[PDB]
Design an enzyme around this catalytic site. Structure first.
Site, PDB file in Angstrom:
ATOM      1  CB  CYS A   1      -1.050   0.511 -11.337  1.00  0.00           C
ATOM      2  SG  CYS A   1      -1.548   1.021  -9.719  1.00  0.00           S
ATOM      3  CB  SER A   2      -4.064   2.093  -7.938  1.00  0.00           C
ATOM      4  OG  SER A   2      -3.516   0.933  -7.355  1.00  0.00           O
ATOM      5  CB  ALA A   3      -6.079   6.580  -9.753  1.00  0.00           C
TER       6      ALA A   3
ATOM      7  CG  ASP B   1      -2.295  -0.629   0.914  1.00  0.00           C
ATOM      8  OD1 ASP B   1      -2.546  -1.026  -0.248  1.00  0.00           O
ATOM      9  OD2 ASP B   1      -3.173  -0.777   1.795  1.00  0.00           O
TER      10      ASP B   1
ATOM     11  CB  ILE C   1       0.376   5.768  -6.907  1.00  0.00           C
ATOM     12  CG1 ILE C   1      -0.140   4.319  -6.857  1.00  0.00           C
ATOM     13  CG2 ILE C   1      -0.626   6.743  -6.278  1.00  0.00           C
ATOM     14  CD1 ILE C   1      -1.120   3.968  -7.861  1.00  0.00           C
ATOM     15  N   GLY C   2       1.743   5.215 -10.378  1.00  0.00           N
ATOM     16  CA  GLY C   2       2.784   4.547 -11.151  1.00  0.00           C
ATOM     17  C   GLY C   2       2.655   3.038 -11.247  1.00  0.00           C
ATOM     18  NE  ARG C   3       1.152   0.297  -6.883  1.00  0.00           N
ATOM     19  CZ  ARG C   3       0.183  -0.213  -6.108  1.00  0.00           C
ATOM     20  NH1 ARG C   3      -0.425  -1.348  -6.431  1.00  0.00           N
ATOM     21  NH2 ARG C   3      -0.184   0.426  -5.011  1.00  0.00           N
ATOM     22  CB  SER C   4       1.822   0.904 -15.473  1.00  0.00           C
ATOM     23  OG  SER C   4       0.618   0.705 -14.776  1.00  0.00           O
TER      24      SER C   4
ATOM     25  CD  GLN D   1       2.905   9.851 -10.962  1.00  0.00           C
ATOM     26  OE1 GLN D   1       3.773  10.623 -11.343  1.00  0.00           O
ATOM     27  NE2 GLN D   1       1.615  10.140 -11.040  1.00  0.00           N
TER      28      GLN D   1
END
Ligand SMILES: [Mg+2]
Length: 281
Positions: A214-216, A180, A218-221, A261
């Site tokens: 991913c989620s809105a 998280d 906050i990156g990861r992709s 991000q």
């Protein structure tokens, strides 16, 4: 080399500063189609907007817009489509894009619920016997199989064009353990997950581009694609040490915003590329 560079930044405590230089260098292109009033309900709040030049177009006459971008890495010969987590009303669109782009794989780097809040719609069936019908785009979707592991899940899904009765097998690669807050302490499981996506054929040239979300906001992709491309270039080039993660990121950044991000995600990307390289080489 990159490990050397990593260490120069780690002891110098300049991650925030290096991150911020890249951000100022980064491309800034128009997103006029995304900002149109008729598309307001197709965009996830606090999420990135797709640049016009690289946006994926739905092949429908009505409204061809989806928040998705094609990242085309010419030298590495990899393409990725990065998109937002589907909204309650864009699941049909999402699977329409997967169909038309001839994607083999979908890479999901978030949980449906994180931080006690919904991050995307439940856009795939959780049970073999309860398939999903998207009437707006004329598709059916069926869970074929599901293999739950400690750090990720892989699902096989079948997508049917209801009009023509054609079917396609899609692999759903669901990374379920990104914390998280912050980044994983070790890139090992993330690299393992990347290798499983690779091993599947989903990133390979015989198929359309993998769809990644991913989620809105906050990156990861971006980390997934950056690490993938960098490792591929290290194998391709006569001089592996010329592969500069900052330059690869900046090139990727031409196709979509919000790839990395935070300073920590950048650090994590370096870390994943270095340990991934040691494992492959
Ligand atoms: Mg163009």
């Amino acid at each position: 080399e990159m490990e050397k560079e990593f260490e120069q930044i780690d002891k110098s405590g300049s991650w925030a500063a290096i991150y911020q230089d890249i951000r100022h260098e980064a491309s800034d292109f128009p997103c006029r189609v995304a900002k149109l009033p008729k598309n307001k309900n197709r965009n996830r709040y606090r999420d990135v907007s797709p640049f016009d030049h690289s946006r994926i177009k739905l092949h429908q006459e009505d409204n061809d817009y989806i928040n998705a971008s094609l990242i085309k890495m010419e030298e590495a010969q990899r393409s990725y489509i990065l998109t937002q987590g589907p909204l309650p009303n864009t699941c049909g669109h999402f699977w329409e894009m997967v169909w038309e782009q001839k994607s083999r794989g979908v890479v999901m780097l978030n949980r449906v619920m994180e931080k006690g809040s919904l991050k995307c719609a439940q856009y795939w069936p959780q049970k073999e016997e309860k398939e999903m019908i998207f009437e707006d785009t004329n598709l059916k979707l069926t869970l074929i199989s599901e293999d739950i592991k400690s750090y990720y899940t892989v699902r096989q899904l079948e997508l049917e064009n209801l009009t023509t009765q054609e079917t396609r097998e899609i692999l759903h690669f669901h990374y379920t353990t990104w914390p998280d807050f912050g980044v994983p302490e070790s890139p090992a499981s993330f690299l393992n997950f990347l290798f499983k996506v690779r091993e599947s054929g989903s990133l390979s040239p015989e198929h359309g581009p993998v769809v990644v979300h991913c989620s809105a906001g906050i990156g990861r992709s971006g980390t997934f694609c950056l690490a993938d491309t960098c490792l591929l270039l290290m194998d391709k080039r006569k001089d592996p040490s010329s592969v500069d993660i900052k330059k690869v990121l900046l090139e990727m950044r031409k196709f979509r915003m919000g790839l990395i991000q935070t300073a920590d995600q950048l650090r994590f990307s370096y870390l994943a590329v270095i340990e991934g390289a040691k494992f492959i080489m």
